[PDB]
């Protein structure tokens, strides 16, 4: 046997190349390691989390350092609307002179990449102004990463390893993470906005050298303690304020104007400061709900196990039995990870949906390529987090769920009617797919036959009504915020609708992305998105609920989360494991996010190009998507290099084909299966043994990739090609046509 892997003697005794492959794939599955105890499991995870945080801080330090070293931050400040931000320099020693000339742009004298992550806008808004300030932040994050790296090592030493009870104390962790990690951090950020960011946006420099004796407001802290909080809202920034200058600048630190700053077309800095102040208060209050050491507070176990509603007998909350759940979550790390991944997935989607419509950073709304990249980035990450939440939900059913301790509770009830859940999810998927596709191809045939007037064009009246209810007067509805006489708009008892005038200006502005006008084309794509959401949920839910067993395989729980099959018997059982459902769901998740990002990109492309009518008339039939979005906007991307020369889009051209190549390679791993390659490898084994002068010899016997491994490898190539191809197209079709 070999020393590697250290955590598995079964793999260490494997005499084939499968030992190396499986060691990488199971290295972080700590629960399956040899001789793993629960206490050692939590301690190893705790130290690993310290390492991941340090990697994040080093990653942020690298972004800051390369901008301060090779970027054009200071030049970009003087003209954010016309200067291209620089990510980092290019050193590729096999470039030709045409390639060097093409990539030397944005005011640089050396080849550079154009930053599309929006960090220039973010740092500018929060008050950063010089490359020295970026450098200091980069150095600080290097030290911060070192601190967390030392902490991970320290909490592995015998005297500092926390006990299992420390990890299992849920109530103190919730209190500290709500009040301190969420609340105090939000309050500290609001302090940075008030003390640094807001003064810097008004032309006055505030730094570590003078922030101690430079009050952020003339009224001082006396107004806060006295109760004269209205003084902080007096004299807000004027509508003709110029960012990073004192011209038209107010003195208020906590306004509630709403809408957008007229010049930057982004959220008011004073509004964002008051937002994080209010959020801090709410979260600090939330952090005092659970009892830790002083008697006062709720006990989560008592709340879940409660069976009395002020004297009356109830099964539990909402008359539903929640008993025994506290031990289920507390003892299942996969159950907790499922909620954590699901919450981050929803939050990542909310980040994407709210950032393009409500840009928080100065001038970021006018960087079209940055807006497209940021929305696509956070939506795709949201899809992956959503898949992971259900993947670890299936792992929970097999590894951590026991029916005895959950007998009769709400979790057990879900498993008892899983057939009704899966069948009804199948019905919704079938209904959406049949009618959405059927109406698309109906419009295809009519438009093809010169009968575009015969299309079925269902107006999205329900969503249009919501837009009108939010203040959009375009559609002619006179309800709620679009009706100035409505009680919602007046707020009759108090008339404290100081949010409304700024909000209505941004809503009815024709040059932003706040409640974009929608028609029949938007109706059909949302129902396509609904189809994608319901099918991807169907695949994931069916895999999680059938993870423990089914009629085809009643004893699936005894075989684990990930196994190839149960053989060709009983009709055949390919892709029967719960892991295979997550494998299949990644395909549907990619397809769904593909529909989402195609819809976002094409709609904004029509707006930015001044050809909104192109989207409204062509998005109602699928040939319009194929011709006017894919074919039409690929022209510049595929001409990055040609027999006549090269331009700055050559990288996106090469990466476009590179993504297609990776996507093609995945088809090999997904279509061809193992036994074909094992027989071929055996023939190559014979050839090597009989060839003279070939003194080499394998120490690990070469074998074809396992059945599960091939599915993962093919999925990886499929996903990487999926992301690379659309990423190159998204950047090239927007940056090539705009700034």
């Amino acid at each position: 046997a070999t020393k590697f892997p250290k955590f598995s003697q079964d793999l260490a005794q494997d005499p084939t190349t499968r030992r190396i492959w499986y060691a990488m794939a199971t290295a972080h599955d700590f629960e399956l390691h040899d001789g793993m105890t629960e206490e050692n499991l939590y301690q190893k995870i705790f130290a690993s989390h310290f390492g991941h945080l340090a990697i994040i801080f080093l990653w942020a330090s690298g972004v800051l350092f390369h901008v301060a070293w090779q970027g054009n931050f200071e030049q970009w400040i003087k003209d954010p609307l016309n200067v291209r931000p620089i990510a980092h320099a290019i050193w590729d020693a096999q470039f030709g002179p045409p390639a060097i000339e093409a990539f030397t742009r944005a005011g640089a004298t050396n080849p550079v990449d154009i930053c599309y992550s929006g960090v220039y806008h973010w740092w500018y808004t929060i008050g950063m102004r010089t490359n020295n300030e970026l450098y200091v932040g980069a150095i600080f994050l290097l030290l911060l990463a070192a601190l967390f790296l030392f902490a991970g090592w320290l909490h592995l030493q015998p005297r500092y390893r926390p006990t299992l009870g420390w990890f299992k104390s849920a109530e103190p962790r919730l209190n500290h993470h709500l009040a301190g990690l969420f609340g105090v951090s939000s309050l500290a950020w609001a302090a940075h906005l008030i003390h640094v960011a807001i003064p810097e946006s008004r032309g006055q420099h505030v730094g570590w050298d003078n922030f101690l004796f430079t009050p952020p407001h003339p009224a001082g802290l006396g107004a806060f303690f006295t109760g004269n909080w209205s003084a902080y809202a007096q004299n807000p920034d004027t509508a003709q304020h110029v960012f990073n200058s004192s011209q038209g600048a107010g003195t208020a630190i906590l306004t509630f104007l709403g809408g957008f700053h007229p010049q930057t077309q982004s959220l008011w800095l004073t509004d964002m400061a008051h937002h994080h102040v209010a959020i801090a208060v709410l979260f600090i209050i939330a952090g005092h709900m659970y009892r830790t050491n002083w008697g006062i507070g709720h006990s989560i176990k008592e709340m879940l196990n409660s069976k009395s509603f002020f004297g009356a007998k109830v099964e539990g909350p909402f008359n539903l039995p929640h008993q025994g759940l506290y031990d289920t979550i507390n003892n299942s790390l996969h159950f907790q990870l499922s909620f954590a991944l699901a919450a981050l997935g929803v939050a990542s989607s909310l980040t994407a949906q709210h950032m393009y419509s409500m840009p928080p950073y100065a001038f970021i709304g006018q960087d079209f390529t940055t807006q497209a990249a940021l929305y696509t980035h956070h939506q795709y990450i949201a899809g992956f987090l959503m898949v992971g939440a259900f993947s670890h939900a299936g792992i929970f059913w097999i590894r951590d769920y026991d029916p005895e301790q959950n007998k009769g509770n709400v979790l057990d009830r879900m498993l008892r009617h899983k057939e009704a859940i899966i069948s009804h999810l199948s019905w919704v998927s079938l209904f959406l797919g049949f009618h959405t596709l059927g109406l698309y191809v109906h419009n295809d045939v009519e438009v093809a036959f010169g009968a575009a007037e015969k299309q079925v064009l269902i107006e999205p009246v329900f969503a249009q009504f919501i837009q009108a209810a939010h203040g959009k007067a375009l559609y002619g509805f006179n309800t709620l915020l679009s009706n100035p006489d409505s009680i919602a708009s007046t707020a009759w008892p108090n008339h404290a609708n100081v949010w409304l005038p700024g909000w209505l200006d941004a809503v009815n502005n024709t040059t932003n992305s706040l409640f974009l006008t929608i028609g029949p084309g938007d109706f059909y794509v949302h129902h396509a998105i609904a189809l994608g959401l319901h099918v991807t949920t169907l695949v994931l839910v069916k895999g999680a609920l059938d993870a423990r067993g089914s009629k085809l395989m009643p004893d699936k729980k005894d075989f684990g989360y990930a196994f190839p099959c149960d053989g060709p018997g009983r009709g055949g059982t390919c892709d029967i494991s719960a892991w295979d459902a997550s494998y299949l769901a990644v395909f549907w998740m990619l397809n769904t996010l593909g529909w989402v990002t195609f819809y976002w990109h094409w709609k904004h492309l029509a707006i930015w190009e001044g050809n909104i009518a192109q989207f409204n008339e062509s998005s109602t039939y699928l040939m319009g998507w194929f011709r006017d979005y894919l074919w039409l906007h690929s022209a510049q991307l595929i001409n990055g290099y040609n027999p006549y020369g090269t331009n700055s889009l050559a990288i996106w051209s090469w990466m476009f084909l590179w993504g297609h190549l990776a996507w093609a390679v995945s088809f090999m791993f997904l279509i061809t299966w193992r036994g074909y390659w094992q027989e071929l490898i055996e023939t190559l084994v014979w050839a090597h043994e009989k060839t003279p002068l070939s003194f080499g010899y394998w120490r690990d016997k070469p074998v074809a990739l396992s059945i599960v491994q091939a599915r993962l490898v093919g999925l990886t190539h499929f996903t990487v090609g999926y992301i690379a191809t659309y990423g190159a197209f998204l950047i090239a079709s927007t940056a090539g046509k705009f700034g």
Partner: protein
């Protein structure tokens, strides 16, 4: 023409464009699909419909595979 000079359908693209598969992607697939992609509202619209029909069946087959 009358002078015996030949102008080809794609004007001699093959020698310089077919040596890269970016040239195949651009000058053959993208460029020569203009007829089928713009055939809607014409007598060739059936070919445009079947162009999408073939694309659908190819993607449809992928779940069986």
């Amino acid at each position: 023409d009358s002078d015996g000079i030949v102008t080809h359908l794609t004007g001699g693209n093959f020698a310089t464009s077919s040596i890269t598969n970016n040239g195949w992607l651009r000058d053959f697939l993208w460029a020569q699909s203009a007829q089928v992609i713009q055939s809607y509202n014409s007598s060739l619209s059936a070919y445009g419909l079947m162009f999408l029909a073939g694309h659908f069946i190819f993607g449809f087959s992928l779940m069986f595979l």
